[PDB]
Design a protein around this ligand. Structure first.
Ligand SMILES: CCCCN(c1cccc(-c2ccc(SC)cc2)c1C)S(=O)(=O)c1ccc(OCC(=O)O)c2ccccc12
Ligand SMILES: CCCCCCO[C@@H]1O[C@H](CO)[C@@H](O)[C@H](O)[C@H]1O
Ligand SMILES: CCCCCCO[C@@H]1O[C@H](CO)[C@@H](O)[C@H](O)[C@H]1O
Length: 255
């Protein structure tokens, strides 16, 4: 009943806080400058499309990834704060939820800007090919591929921005997070969001392909995806000594 209005407030918060909507993304994807080799990557840097001291091609890509990720974390923070029930939480719990939730949300939203062939970069000014990213030296290519596999299956669910606003909110407001102080309040908020989501999916996808429980599965898939990604990020930290890691991302991964 009150859930329809509750979803509108979340959707509003999403529209207010993210630079790239799926609506914007899909329209661009169907012109952005194409990065498919070293030459085009260099031409993208020469101002036409767009940091620590230069090392190499794969590390340059890794550095630009961090920049993007840091910026997405900022947006997710503002999104979450635009939800009143999130803002009533003590700041430590807010930080705990963002700590353990941002990468799950990042990979979910990433599907919005991805097709079988590649992904948009630089606020839609660029399109980097999947084949080009495959060509980067290990471990970077290994880290990248699973996100394509995830994003393609996820895009088959044909969610829109209003669906995603609730889905991301549910990811952030998660009672399972380690070190959470007020577990009961968060669980109660999660439950309201999930109820709003099921209600919203009924109204928005009337002939739903068992859509709500498939999204719950995707949430579990995202948790596994982040687990594996964190393991791969630990490998970078251990093996790539000369490569710098953004302080905030270091804080997120810590413990
Ligand atoms: C669907 C493929 C996603 C691949 N990764 C990603 C995500 C967003 C932007 C970019 C990117 C690509 C090209 C350029 S210029 C040629 C710039 C950016 C990439 C590679 S990823 O989502 O798998 C990914 C996410 C985050 C990473 O480190 C940051 C963090 O964990 O906070 C990644 C690090 C290495 C490889 C992929 C990363
Ligand atoms: C908004 C995203 C912030 C995620 C970084 C959280 O970083 C966390 O901050 C806590 C409070 O300073 C620290 O106690 C904790 O050690 C650190 O991992
Ligand atoms: C931008 C790259 C920052 C990632 C550095 C990874 O850092 C590591 O992540 C592990 C997670 O497996 C944590 O257990 C460990 O404490 C942390 O130092």
């Amino acid at each position: 009943a009150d859930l329809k209005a509750f979803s509108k407030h979340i959707y509003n918060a999403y529209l207010k806080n993210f630079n790239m909507t799926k609506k914007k993304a899909r329209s661009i994807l169907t012109a952005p400058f194409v990065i498919h080799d070293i030459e085009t990557l260099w031409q993208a840097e020469k101002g036409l499309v767009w940091l620590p001291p230069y090392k190499e091609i794969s590390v340059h890509v890794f550095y630009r990834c961090q920049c993007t990720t840091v910026e997405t974390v900022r947006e997710l923070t503002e999104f979450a704060k635009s939800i009143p029930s999130f803002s009533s939480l003590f700041l430590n719990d807010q930080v705990t939820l963002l700590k353990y939730g941002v990468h799950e949300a990042i990979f979910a939203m990433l599907a919005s800007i991805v097709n079988k062939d590649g992904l948009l970069v630089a606020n839609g000014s660029g399109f980097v090919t999947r084949e080009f990213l495959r060509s980067l030296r290990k471990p970077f290519s290994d880290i990248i591929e699973p996100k394509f596999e995830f994003a393609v299956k996820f895009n088959a669910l044909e969610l829109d921005d209003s669906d995603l606003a609730l889905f991301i909110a549910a990811i952030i407001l998660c009672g399972d997070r380690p070190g959470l102080m007020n577990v009961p309040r968060v669980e109660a908020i999660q439950d309201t969001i999930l109820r709003a989501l099921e209600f919203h999916l009924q109204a928005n996808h009337p002939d739903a392909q068992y859509l709500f429980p498939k999204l719950l599965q995707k949430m579990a898939d995202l948790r596994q995806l982040v687990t594996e990604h964190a393991q791969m990020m630990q490998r970078i930290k251990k093996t790539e000594t000369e490569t710098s890691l953004h302080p905030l991302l270091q804080e997120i991964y810590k413990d």
